[PDB]
Amino acid sequence: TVAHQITLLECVGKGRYGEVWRGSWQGENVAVKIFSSRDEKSWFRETELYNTVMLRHENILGFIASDMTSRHSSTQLWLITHYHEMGSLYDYLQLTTLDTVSCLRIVLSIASGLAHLHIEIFGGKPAIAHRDLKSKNILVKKNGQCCIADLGLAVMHSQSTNQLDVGNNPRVGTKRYMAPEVLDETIQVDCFDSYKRVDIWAFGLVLWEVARRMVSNGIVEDYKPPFYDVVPNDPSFEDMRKVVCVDQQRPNIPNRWFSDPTLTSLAKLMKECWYQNPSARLTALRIKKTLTKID
Numbered sequence: 001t002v003a004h005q006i007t008l009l010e011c012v013g014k015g016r017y018g019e020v021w022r023g024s025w026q027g028e029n030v031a032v033k034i035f036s037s038r039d040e041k042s043w044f045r046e047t048e049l050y051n052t053v054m055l056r057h058e059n060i061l062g063f064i065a066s067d068m069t070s071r072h073s074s075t076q077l078w079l080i081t082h083y084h085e086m087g088s089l090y091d092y093l094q095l096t097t098l099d100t101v102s103c104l105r106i107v108l109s110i111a112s113g114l115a116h117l118h119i120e121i122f123g124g125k126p127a128i129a130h131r132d133l134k135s136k137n138i139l140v141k142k143n144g145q146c147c148i149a150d151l152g153l154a155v156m157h158s159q160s161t162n163q164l165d166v167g168n169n170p171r172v173g174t175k176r177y178m179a180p181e182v183l184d185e186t187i188q189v190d191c192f193d194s195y196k197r198v199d200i201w202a203f204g205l206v207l208w209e210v211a212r213r214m215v216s217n218g219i220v221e222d223y224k225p226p227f228y229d230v231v232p233n234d235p236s237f238e239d240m241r242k243v244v245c246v247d248q249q250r251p252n253i254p255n256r257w258f259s260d261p262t263l264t265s266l267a268k269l270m271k272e273c274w275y276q277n278p279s280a281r282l283t284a285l286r287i288k289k290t291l292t293k294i295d
């Protein structure tokens with residue numbers, strides 16, 4: 001009596017995350033994520049968050065329902081959300097280039113969702129950090145704004161209790177996007193601010209991925225993932241620690257940015273998301289204000 005009301009129409013992805021299907025519910029398109037059997041803790045955390053918190057914002061993936069169902073005679077865990085036909089930012093950036101307006105609309109919309117997650121509202125949601133932000137977890141909507149998905153690693157904090165709720169999930173972040181303090185295990189795990197600073201690091205990487213695809217002086221970079229030149233596909237913990245902690249590498253700023261105002265303003269933001277000192281990074285709210293101002 002939720003799963004039963006839904007028809008899986010097509011599988012639009014299969015990976016370590018499980019599967020994502022386009023489905024119909026009352027004849028309306030929905031996305032259905034089917035969690036891998038190894039990943040009940042991500043389903044549990046996401047269902048806990050979207051059910052217990054008023055988590056609703058233009059730039060956060062819109063929750064509809066969570067259910068358990070039997071298929072091929074075993075338990076499947078479903079998360080059911082709005083369907084975005086364009087798919088992920090990761091796929092979008094491969095199939096197309098951006099003008100100034102569409103590059104800024106994308107990165108401002110991501111900053112707006114991230115600032116909404118990071119801020120505690122009273123009277124209402126706790127502060128939330130994401131902990132696995134990446135271009136593959138961000139969906140592009142038909143208005144050309146984005147929405148953030150995949151809250152299964154999220155951490156919450158309430159000023160009322162000054163309680164940090166870190167959950168019970170053995171899953172770790174996407175290795176490519178892990179901040180230095182995560183890779184070297186120096187992150188201060190009892191301070192909520194540590195988790196928000198991990199998201200700013202990842203946001204910087206996504207800003208880099210997007211800016212590369214904005215046309216300036218008639219030219220543009222091909223899509224590349226962060227650190228494409230120094231680590232393999234599916235990089236290991238050790239691959240990433242060598243690069244980010246030991247060599248202290250950062251993605252290169254291309255040369256053709258430096259005489260463009262928009263891209264100089266974006267390159268400034270990304271460097272201030274990437275300080276090795278977490279405390280020195282900008283906040284999501286500071287990022288959102290600055291992008292509101294850029295032309």
Ligand SMILES: CCn1cc(-c2ccnc(Nc3ccc(N4CCNCC4)cc3)n2)c(-c2cccnc2)n1
Pocket residue numbers: 012013017020031032033061079080081082083084085086087088091136137139149150
């Ligand atoms: C694996 C990333 N992901 C995408 C979606 C998601 C959420 C909502 N809508 C869509 N739509 C979508 C449309 C087209 C594609 N394709 C584009 C062409 N290239 C192949 C993929 C992919 C996804 N995807 C979700 C998701 C779903 C439910 C709950 N939580 C997360 N995860």
